[PDB]
Amino acid sequence: AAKIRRDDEVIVLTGKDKGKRGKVKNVLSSGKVIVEGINLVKKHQKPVPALNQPGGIVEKEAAIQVSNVAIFNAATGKADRVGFRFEDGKKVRFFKSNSETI
Amino acid sequence: VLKRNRSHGFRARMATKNGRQVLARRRAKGRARLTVS
RNA sequence: CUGCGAAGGUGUGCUGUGAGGCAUGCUGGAGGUAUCAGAAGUGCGAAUGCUGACAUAAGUAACGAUAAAGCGGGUGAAAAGCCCGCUCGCCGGAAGACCAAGGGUUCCUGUCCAACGUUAAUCGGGGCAGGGUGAGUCGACCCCUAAGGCGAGGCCGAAAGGCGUA
């Protein structure tokens, strides 16, 4: 019963990048999600003599709180809450404000 | 080692009731080393 | 009241006889406070009060053969004693070596190493990690026997036990 899932179109509600849309890549058990292209962090990658020698500065994605993002409605062009309803015995997600199935 | 075990070992403690009480008190306190061995 | 910057801390200024409070700058960056009341683990200079906090004393063990030392080279922050090359002096029917008994990871490879209030060690057996003990005819254990020891009866002794056969 998680509102945010593996493949979801979400929009940032708060933070330095509020309002930019994106797709969630994965969700952490600590109530955090990773969405590509918004929370860029410049990590100084220490060089290693192993098979991989990227070194330099890497542009990674930093996880953000689940509550900081909402599913994009994609029809009203604004963030909307999502709830659960039982249909033919299968639990599904649905928007609000003219709620329609995903 | 021999005298230590025969004086404060597990078998020595359990032989008499008072030693049995000593083991009971150690267990209640939850000591890692119940006895010497 | 409150990010044009809280409380605490460090300065200055004002007020009251005294305990203090209000208004700020700097530091700090997350909640704080007055009036009318109530509830007490509430304020510190000593009880040989308690735990760290200016201090007069620095982590590495073998000084007990009258056979003999010195020179060179390599390593090292250190060289009369270790390793390599050139000599001399003892032992050499053993001061060699291989077995029994006794002893039971000490013998084989890389390492805690720029050192407190001025600690200046000639030994690569130390504490903490990795390997080797390989078997028909090496040996013991397995089979039979004496002494010693033990052991259902009988023999010695009123029983038992001891002696003693299998």
Added chain:
RNA sequence: UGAUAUGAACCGUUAUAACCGGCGAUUUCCGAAUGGGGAAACCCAGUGUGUUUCGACACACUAUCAUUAACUGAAUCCAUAGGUUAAUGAGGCGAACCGGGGGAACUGAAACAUCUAAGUACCCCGAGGAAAAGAAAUCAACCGAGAUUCCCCCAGUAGCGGCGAGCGAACGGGGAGCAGCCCAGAGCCUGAAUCAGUGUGUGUGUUAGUGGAAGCGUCUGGAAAGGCGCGCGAUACAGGGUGACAGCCCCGUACACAAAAAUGCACAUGCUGUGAGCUCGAUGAGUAGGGCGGGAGGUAUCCUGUCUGAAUAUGGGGGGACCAUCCUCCAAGGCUAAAUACUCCUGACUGACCGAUAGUGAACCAGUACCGUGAGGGAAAGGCGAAAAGAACCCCGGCGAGGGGAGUGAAAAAGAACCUGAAACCGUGUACGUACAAGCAGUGGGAGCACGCUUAGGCGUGUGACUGCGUUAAUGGGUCAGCGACUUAUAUUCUGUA
């Protein structure tokens, strides 16, 4: 695919992932350890059956004590004891409270030791899930009351003690509780009710949960939950996490709902078993009294070693004894719900108790490090950031540590001894005073000089030559910070107020 702890190799996507709950299989060595022994995590077992390999392989049973059954059976004919086999049960560990069997000191007194402390601390055995007790040989001297325990009055009373300190009642009244039976042994009449055990079905509840409405935007700011203007909802503003203090970004609460299996609390039904009315006996068939010894002491009441023998609703016993007046009361087998007691473990709720020298010993890999033969007592140590991408490259140095740049972040007076960083102590830089200095390192008056103000006004701050007034090396200590030193409860008395 536990955490410390990144990555890689795998599994899952229109119903066998993981996680949680319930029902099973499996559960070695050591520890009550059951075959024995010893120095607890060490070695060694026996018998029977199957084993493709006739040098094997695997598993069960077997201790002691008590009960029951079977076989054998003395000494001393039979009986009985002992021994063998099978089944069942008992044994150990961990709070508090209660019961049974035993039993101290200190603290108290002007020394008649007893009385108090004390039927206490501690120690031993067993049972229950509350235990003990629990339906009168009892109170009331003839109004009445009717089981036990605990709490609140009578009551710091009446009594008791070298009448000294101390210890410490009944009856009556007002509440919760307010449901009692069987055996001393029977004649007659029965699928006659209820209660128990073993099953099914219905309703409810416990052990994983689902559904679940509701604030957009702007200013300061790197980032917004708060401010200003404007709404909805309120059965829901209960709490916590959520970049700065969040009802309405989320996870949740109230309301409405769920059960494959197991378990618990009420009924009905089927099977088995225990069981009502109408009457007739008895009132524990070796159970007293008396005699002897000890404790609660010449002694009322209670319990018993040995040796005799009559009763008990007909009749036998008590505090103001009198035809052992009258009324009440029935004395040596168990069981007995609940009220009253207790919190080592779970979930929810509560908080003017506590916030890292506090609180439990431990907010934490602390029942630790360390000390000891053993028992026992028992440390220090909390906080970087929203995200640890944690440090590319370059310089000095030893291919370290430490320090100086760049880059990332709002901030590097956040850079692995890392939030805010005090008192005291140890350095650098500037100004002033003292350079054969010592008399409590203060106070009053006052000169010169430096650094800030005032167009001249003997008033900043800091330094204080000289002069006047001026000692515990008879107590502890090198300095400073933090914690702690007249509290809480039960009576009486006094003051003030409502």
